[PDB]
Write a protein that binds this DNA or RNA. Sequence first.
DNA 1: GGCTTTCGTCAACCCTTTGCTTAT
Lengths: 302, 302, 246, 174
Amino acid sequence: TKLKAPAVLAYSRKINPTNALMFAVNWSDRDNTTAVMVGTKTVAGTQSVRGNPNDADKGNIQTVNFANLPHNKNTLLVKYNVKFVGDVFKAELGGGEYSNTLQTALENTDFGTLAYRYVYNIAAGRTLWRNRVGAESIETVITVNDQTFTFSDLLVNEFDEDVDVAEIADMVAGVLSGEGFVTLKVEHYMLLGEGSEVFPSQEFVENSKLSKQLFDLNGQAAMHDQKIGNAIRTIDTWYEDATTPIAVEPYGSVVRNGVAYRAGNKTDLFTLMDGAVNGKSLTEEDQMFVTANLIRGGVFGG
Amino acid sequence: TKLKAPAVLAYSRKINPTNALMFAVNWSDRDNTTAVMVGTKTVAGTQSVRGNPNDADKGNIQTVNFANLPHNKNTLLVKYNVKFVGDVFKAELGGGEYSNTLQTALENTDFGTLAYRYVYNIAAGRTLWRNRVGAESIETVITVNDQTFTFSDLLVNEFDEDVDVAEIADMVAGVLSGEGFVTLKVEHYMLLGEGSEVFPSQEFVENSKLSKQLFDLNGQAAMHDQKIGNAIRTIDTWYEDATTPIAVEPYGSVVRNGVAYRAGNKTDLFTLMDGAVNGKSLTEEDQMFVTANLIRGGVFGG
Amino acid sequence: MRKFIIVKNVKVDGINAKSSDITVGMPPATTFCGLGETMSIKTGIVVKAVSYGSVKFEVRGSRFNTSVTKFAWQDRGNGGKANNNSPIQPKPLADGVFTLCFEVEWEDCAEVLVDKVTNFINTARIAGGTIASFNKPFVKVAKDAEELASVKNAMMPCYVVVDCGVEVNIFEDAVNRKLQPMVNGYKKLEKIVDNKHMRDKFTPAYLATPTYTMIGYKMVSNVDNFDQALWQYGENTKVKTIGGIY
Amino acid sequence: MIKEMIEDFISKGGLIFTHSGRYTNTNNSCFIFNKNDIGVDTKVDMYTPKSAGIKNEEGENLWQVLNKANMFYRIYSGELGEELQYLLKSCCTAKEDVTTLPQIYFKNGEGYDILVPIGNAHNLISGTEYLWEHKYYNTFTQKLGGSNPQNCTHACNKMRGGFKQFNCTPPQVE
DNA sequence: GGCTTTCGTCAACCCTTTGCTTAT
C-alpha cells in the first residue's frame, strides 16, 4: 500500500561550517588581527531566584568566562569557512527505494531560493547571533573561489533582493542541485566598540566550577560550527503562521521558545516526506523544507 | 560428481590494511605532521525523532566526539599501510578436493584487473570516504618498495585507466597470483581547508557519556582497518544492474543501504563457487568476483 | 648460551582482544607462544621461550563496552537474510604496539636470523592483527645472568607481564590482590570425534576451556629477573615462565 | 515445582552444561558437562531451543532456581531424592559442534594437539555476580546473543544486563 | 526425499564510569 521509510536511514550534513575564530581588528585596519582570548571573570552577584525569596539578601559569587575586544580595537572579526557539499538526496544510511523515489520527487525544488536564503543568512550576518546587537555598522566579506563579495548592511529577517547574494546563490545552487562542493571563506566585521563585550558560543559544561564556559581552541574566543550552521539554515518561513525564519528542523523546532512550529499540523518533515514518497505532491515552499532538511541531514527514519 | 562444500571453508585475509592515522599538515609544507586530536563536544539540538511529535518542543543534549583540523593547518594527512599477501587459494579451515579443485578452476582470472581495482581504491582515495568530499584536491602518495608513486586526480566511481595505478597493479597481481607481500605504505593528502572537519571511523559502542565515539589511537584520530579494507575491496561492478562499485561480499550485500545486490538471483559467492567446483563455465566477471572474495576471505559455513 | 632476538615497536593493528570469554584486552601468553611456535614451523628456527610487552595498547571502545565489530553476511543459505543487518557475535578488537623477545638456538650468524624473522613477521599476525610497522630485528646474546639482563633492558618502553600465580581462583585474587587474569593454558575436557571439519584431521582433537593465571605488568627494567618474564610451554598444555611465579 | 520443570526441560530440549561455545558464537550448539569441576559455588547453566520453559509461579524459571543457594549441588548429591538425581544426570550429557569454534594448536611436549577453546559457564555467571557484589570496576560488559538473548543460553536470557569481562588493558608508556 | 525459502515462536536487565605499572 504505502512505501515506508527504512528503519535505518540517515542523511549527511551538506552545510559544513568551521568553528569560527573571533579576532580583534580596527574598522580601517582589518589586517592587524589579534586573538580575542577567553579569560575568566569571577563576578559578585545577587541571589534572585523565583522560588526562594528568603535567600535573597545573600549574593552569589559566580566565576564566568568573558570575552572582550582589547581597548585599542573596536571591531570584532569572525572568521570561518562554510563548505556547501553537494549530493543532497544521496543518503548516507539506507538509500534503497525511498531515498531514490524522493530524489525524483524533489527534482524541481527551488534550490536557488534555498541557496539565496542560506548565503543571505551568512551575508546579512545572522551567523553572529548576539554579536550583532549594538554594532554601528556590519560588514561581511565572502571570498568564494577567486572572488570577493562585500555586504555591509542587509536586513536580517527579510530576505531582500540584491545581486551579489544572488551570484553566490547561483554558484551554490549549482552545487546543491548537482554534485561537487563550494566553499565560502566568510569574514564578519562588526564595528562594536573599543573594549565592548564579545559573545562567543558557550560550551555545555556539567558540574563545572564556571557558571559560563565559552568555547575556545587554544584560548581564542570561538563560536561553535553547529551555531553557525543553525543560523545558516534559519530559512523556514513556510510554517503555519510564519512571522520569522526559524531553523529547518524536522519538526520546525525552536528549543529557545519551547515550541515546535511544524508538529501537529501535518507539516513536519516526516509526513511530507512520506507523502512525497507515496505519490502525494508537495507545495514549493514545502518541497524547499524537505530538501532543506536533506541538506541539514539527520536520522530521518524510525 | 556433487563436490559438496565442507562445513566451514575459511580463507585468510589477503589484503592486510592497517588503521589509518589522521594527521594535520599544510598543503605546501607537508612535513609538520601534527596529530588530529579527537575532542569531546557536547551539543544542544532538538529531538526530531520519527513519530515522536510531543517531545519536539524539547531539546536533546548529546556529547559527541569530534575531530577537526587545527586552524593553522589546511590538509588532512591519512597514513596507513596495505599489505597484499598472496596465498589466496590456501584454506585455514578445510581444503581438500574442494579448495584444490577451486584453485584449478580459478587459475585463469585477471589478477591484474583485480589488483588494478584494488590499488585504484587506495589511489583514487575511497579509503577516506567522507574525508574525500569537500576536498579541493586529493593528492595520494603510494610508496611501494623503493618506488614512490603519486596520484592527484582520480574519479573514485569509474576505474579510468591510469599508467601508474597499473604499474603497482602488476606487482600486486604478481604477489596475489604467487606468494609474498608487496606492502603499500600509502600517504593521503586532502586539501580540505583551514579548520575543516575530518571524519574518522566511529566506534559501534554502547557509550554512556558519548553518543558518537570516534576511533582514537593514543588520542590521535584514526580510521578502522576493516573500514580501510572495505574501501579497498569496493570493486564489484559485476552484479545485476550495476551502477556503483560495492564491496565484494559473499552475498554482494551492503547492510548500510539495506539491500543485497547479489542475493536471490543465483549470483552469490556460494552458488558460483559450487558451479566452479562441480564444473561450469563461469564468465570472467563472476570468476573475478569469487577470487576477490577469496582474497577477502571469511568463513563459509553451511 | 642464550641468543635473544628482540623486535620492538610492533604496531599490530586489529588484535581481536577476546582472549577468553571473561578476559578482553591484551592477547595472552598462549598467543605469543603460538606465534613463536608458528615461527618455528614456518622458518625453522627453534624458539623455546618468548617474551612480549606493551609500548602502547588500547582496546577500542568505551570504558566498559568494547567496539562491536560489524559482521559480514558469510554463511551458506543466508541470502534472504542479507538485506538487513547481520547478527553479531562477541568479538572485541584492540589496537596496540608490542615489543617482543624470543629465545632461539640458531648457532649461526646474526644478520641471517634477523632475516629469517623479518620475512616471517611481515607474513604473520599477532592475534589476528595486522603488523603495520615494526622496528628492525636485532640479535643480542646472553653469557651470564647479567648479560641476559642487558637484553631485558633492551626491549624497552614496555610492560612485560610476569606470572604472579593463582591463589584460590581468579575472581578472588582480582579484587583482593589488585591484579588481572590471563589465559596461561587450556584444560582438556573431551575428545573431538568428528575430525572431518577440523583444521588438520590427523592431529588429535580435544575440546578445552581456558585456565588462567594472574599477571602483572612490571616495566622490564624494574623486573629483577628476565627468566620470570620469558614464557614457554609446559606439560599439561600450560604456558609458563622459566623463573616461575614472581 | 522442581520436578515438573525438569520433565519440562528435558522435553523441550534440555542440556545442562557447564561449558559451551555459545558464549563465543551463538551459531554454535556445542554443550559439554564436566564432571570433575562441580563445587559448592559452581554455577551450572542450561539450554533449551529459544530458551523455552515455564516458571515456578513466583517469576523464576529453571535456571535461577537451580542457581540459587547451591540447589544444583543439592540435587547432584541427592538431598532432594534419587528420582531427581537420575533426571538431572540424564539431563547432563554431551554435544559436539566445532562449527564456528576457534581451533588452535597447542604442544603436547613432543608433538601438537589441535585444541578448541570454549567458554566456561561457572566462570561467566560467577564472575558477573562476584565482580558486581565486590564492586570490581576495571572490567568490561558484553551482552551475549545480541538483541535476542533467548537464543544463546538460559543465562543469556535471564542476565540481559550483560556479562562482565575483565579489562585486560596493559599500561602505556609516555 | 531432502530442500530451500519465508513466516511463526519466545522472550524480558541491576548496575559500574581508571589504573593495570610507572624506562636499559
